[PDB]
C-alpha cells in the first residue's frame, strides 16, 4: 500500500537502483508495489521481482539455519540450559521468513499466475510458487507440513508439464525449474533418486539441443547446465 502513490515506472527504476546499492529489501518493496499496479510484468520486470525476493529470503534462510543449528546443539544431552532465548529468536526469524514467503505467494495468487498465458511467464511464476512453498517447507513442522510440501510439488509439476510442452530443452527457465525441482526432491521430498534422475535427464536433453543456439544463448544454457552437473557431483 505504501507504494500506491508512486508511478509504476518510478518503482521499476528505483528497484534497479536498489539492486545497484545492494538494498534488496527496498528492491523487493518497490517490486511489490509495481506488481500491485495490476499490470502484467515484462520479462525484465519478472526477473527484478525474483532477484529481490530471492536475496531477501536467502538471507533469512541462512540466518534461520545458523540459529537452528545453535538450537539443536543447545538441546543435546550435556548441553547447558540457556533459557528460551535461542528458540525465541529462531522463531522470530522463522516468522519473518514465513511472512516474506506468504507475501510472494500472495502476489503470485493475486494475480500474476492467473493472467500469465505465455509459457515464459507462466512457467516462471509457477517455479516461483514452488520455490516459496519449498522455503516454507524447510521450516515447517506442524499439522500442515505435508500439505505445504504437496503445494510445492504441485506448482513445480504444473510448471514442468508446461515447460516440456512449450519450451526447448535448453530454455534457461526450463533448466532452472528442473534444477530447483530436483533440489526439492532431494532435500524436501526425501527422493534422492528422483532428484538425480531429473538432473541427469535434464542435463542430457539440454546437451543435445545446444547445437541449435547462438553463442549468447549457449552461454545462458550452459551456465545452468553446470549447476545441474554440480548437484549431480555432490549427490553421486
Amino acid at each position: 500500500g505504501a507504494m500506491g502513490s508512486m508511478e509504476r515506472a518510478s518503482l521499476i527504476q528505483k528497484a534497479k537502483l536498489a539492486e545497484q546499492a545492494e538494498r534488496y529489501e527496498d528492491m523487493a518493496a518497490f517490486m511489490k508495489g509495481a506488481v500491485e499496479k495490476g499490470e502484467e510484468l515484462s520479462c525484465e520486470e519478472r526477473n527484478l521481482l525474483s532477484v529481490a525476493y530471492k536475496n531477501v529470503v536467502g538471507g533469512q534462510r541462512a540466518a534461520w539455519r545458523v540459529l537452528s543449528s545453535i538450537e539443536q546443539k543447545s538441546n543435546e544431552e550435556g548441553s547447558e540450559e540457556k533459557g528460551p532465548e535461542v528458540r525465541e529468536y529462531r522463531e522470530k526469524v522463522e516468522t519473518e521468513l514465513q511472512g516474506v514467503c506468504d507475501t510472494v505467494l500472495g502476489l503470485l495468487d493475486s494475480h500474476l499466475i492467473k493472467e500469465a498465458g505465455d509459457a515464459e511467464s507462466r512457467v516462471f511464476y509457477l517455479k516461483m510458487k514452488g520455490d516459496y512453498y519449498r522455503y516454507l517447507a524447510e521450516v515447517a513442522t506442524g499439522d500442515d507440513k505435508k500439505r505445504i510440501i504437496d503445494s510445492a510439488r504441485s506448482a513445480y509439476q504444473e510448471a514442468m508439464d508446461i515447460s516440456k510442452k512449450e519450451m526447448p530443452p535448453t530454455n534457461p527457465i526450463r533448466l532452472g525449474l528442473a534444477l530447483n525441482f530436483s533440489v526439492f526432491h532431494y532435500e524436501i521430498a526425501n527422493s534422492p533418486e528422483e532428484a538425480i534422475s531429473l538432473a541427469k535427464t535434464t542435463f542430457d536433453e539440454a546437451m543435445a539441443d545446444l547445437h541449435t543456439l547462438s553463442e549468447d544463448s549457449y552461454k545462458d544454457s550452459t551456465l545452468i547446465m553446470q549447476l545441474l552437473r554440480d548437484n549431480l557431483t555432490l549427490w553421486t
Binding site: 534444477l179 533440489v183 532435500e187 545452468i224 554440480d230 555432490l234 549427490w235
Partner: peptide, 5 residues
C-alpha cells in the same frame, strides 16, 4: 547446500 536459481 545444493545449487538453486
Amino acid at each position: 547446500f545444493p545449487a538453486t536459481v
